[PDB]
Design a protein around this ligand. Structure first.
Ligand SMILES: *[C@@H]1O[C@H](CO)[C@@H](O[C@@H]2O[C@H](CO)[C@@H](O)[C@H](O)[C@H]2NC(C)=O)[C@H](O)[C@H]1NC(C)=O
Lengths: 49, 49, 49
């Protein structure tokens, strides 16, 4: 099992998906189309402000 | 380039700490498993293995 | 002064090279769901209008 943790903006919280394209989705982290597993997202505006 | 955050930023610009779990469930030696109690092993009898 | 829903503000777009990647800073973008045209490789399409 592999876990990867980072931070992204709200408009791109759904940008991370297998085969998505944009800035992050193709330049900083992509998920392969056959990726199995899932992503976890929550707001950290209280702390990262 | 700078990726600063301000608490005055609204939804879609607040920081979103994202963690993704990647699995590799396939025919390969198992190391991570759930909390299923292993029972005694039986042979030559039809059993839901 | 965005128009009310009952009288929506329609705009004509003419000959132009429109980059659908610089607009990402123009709004919070709470939801960016899209139909048959995915926004991912949207900058590689030519439209009648
Ligand atoms: C619909 O289009 C725009 C979007 O709000 C409104 O604003 C003007 O649009 C014209 C083009 O049609 C531009 O040339 C102007 O620069 C825009 N601004 C102003 C202040 O005129 C337009 O008024 C809207 N039309 C309506 C509501 O009937």
């Amino acid at each position: 099992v592999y876990a990867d943790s980072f931070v992204i903006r709200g408009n791109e919280v759904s940008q991370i998906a297998p085969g998505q394209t944009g800035n992050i989705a193709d330049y900083n982290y992509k998920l392969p189309d056959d990726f199995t597993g899932c992503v976890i997202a929550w707001n950290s505006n209280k702390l990262d402000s | 380039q700078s990726y600063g955050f301000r608490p005055t930023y609204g939804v879609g610009h607040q920081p979103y700490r994202v963690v993704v779990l990647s699995f590799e469930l396939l025919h390969a030696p198992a190391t991570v498993c759930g909390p299923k109690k292993s029972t005694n092993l039986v042979k030559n009898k039809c059993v839901n293995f | 002064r965005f128009a009310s829903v009952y009288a929506w503000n329609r705009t004509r777009i003419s000959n132009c090279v429109a980059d659908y990647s610089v607009l990402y800073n123009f709004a919070p973008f709470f939801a960016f769901k899209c139909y048959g045209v995915s926004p991912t490789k949207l900058n590689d399409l030519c439209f009648t209008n």
